[PDB]
């Protein structure tokens, strides 16, 4: 796996970010995590959804450098969103959300599970600490 540069376009919610990648606008979805829903009427605004959204926005806007890292398998989902680990000054947003209890580990689809154990350990800590989603 390797990290590639990208420039911000707009943070959509906790786990979906529009980025300029190789000079094309693409929507990315964070691998291995789900922040609670805030757009879809079928789930409604779920608790911590808005909180997750503001956390990601904050983290990605303040970054000096944004990087994306695809995993070993599919690089897009069925909606055409890029599937990646995204880093803001070398800090993985996917992990940072999980560590705050603002996302759960989810959508673990082989072979895109390289950081699964890393993320699960951050989740276990947020749970033990009773943070946000786990409170
Ligand atoms: C993170 C991730 C999501 N998805 C798909 C599965 C879910 O589609 P369905 O909605 O059709 O089930 C959806 C979860 O995304 P959101 O959390 O943005 O809803 O995106 C993948 O296909 N692969 C991935 O790695
Ligand atoms: Ca979500």
3D structure, described in words:
There is one protein chain. With 135 residues, this protein is α+β, with helices and mostly antiparallel strands. It has one domain: Beta Barrel (OB fold (Dihydrolipoamide Acetyltransferase, E2P)). The chain contains 3 helices and 8 strands, in the order ββββαβββαβα. It has helices spanning 49-61, 93-99, 116-128, and strands spanning 4-11, 16-21, 24-30, 33-34, 66-69, 82-88, 91-92, 104-105. Helix 2 (93-99) runs parallel beside helix 3 (116-128). The chain starts with a strand and ends in a 7-residue tail after the last helix. 36% of the residues are buried. The protein binds thymidine-3',5'-diphosphate and calcium ion (CA). Thymidine-3',5'-diphosphate binds next to loops. It is classed as hydrolase. The entry lists the keywords Staphylococcal nuclease, pdTp, cavity, pressure, hydrolase.
Relevant terms:
monomer; 135 residues; alpha+beta; OB fold (Dihydrolipoamide Acetyltransferase, E2P); five-stranded mixed beta barrel; two-stranded antiparallel ribbon; 3 helices; globular; binds thymidine-3',5'-diphosphate; binds calcium ion; Nuclease A
Précis, in short:
By secondary structure, the protein is of the alpha+beta class.
Structural class: alpha+beta
Domains, number:
1
The tally of beta strands, per DSSP, is 8
Count, helices: 3
Strand content: 25-35%
Organism: Staphylococcus aureus
Subcellular location: Secreted
Protein name: Nuclease A
Active site: 29, 37, 81
